[PDB]
DNA sequence: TGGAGTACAAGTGTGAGGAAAAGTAGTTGGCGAGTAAAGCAGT
C-alpha cells in the first residue's frame, strides 16, 4: 500500500537482482566475478549517486541519496 | 525388548545497531572679516 510503504531496496538489491540474471542465462560469472568487478571499479556499485543522474540528484533528500552511492561493500 | 531423555539440530518469537548527507548550531569577524545705527538699560 502507499500508505507507509517503506520499500527495501539497497545497493545490495542491485547486484542481487544481477546475479539471478546470470544463472537464468547460465553465466560462468559469480559473486567473486562481481566483487572482482566492483571493488576494482568496473562496474558502476561505488560511487552511484554522485556522479549518475547529473539532472535528477538534487531534489532527492539526504538519507536517500546516502543509500544509492556505494557505501561499503557487502 | 522396549522405555526415562539429552543431546545437537533443527526451528520461530523479541527491537535495535550503524550509515550519512544536508541542514543547524555557538563561535569570531567585519561592516555600514566691516560701518553702521537706536534701544534701554545705566547713574
Known amino acids: 500500500?502507499?500508505?507507509?510503504?517503506?520499500?527495501?531496496?539497497?545497493?545490495?538489491?542491485?547486484?542481487?537482482?544481477?546475479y539471478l540474471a546470470s544463472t537464468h542465462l547460465s553465466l560462468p560469472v559469480y559473486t567473486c566475478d562481481y566483487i572482482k568487478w566492483i571493488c576494482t571499479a568496473k562496474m558502476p556499485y561505488f560511487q552511484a549517486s554522485e556522479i549518475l543522474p547529473k539532472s535528477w540528484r538534487i531534489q532527492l533528500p539526504n538519507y536517500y541519496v546516502s543509500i544509492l552511492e556505494g557505501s561499503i561493500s557487502p
Open 1 to 18: 500500500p502507499q500508505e507507509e510503504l517503506k520499500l527495501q531496496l539497497h545497493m545490495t538489491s542491485t547486484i542481487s537482482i544481477l
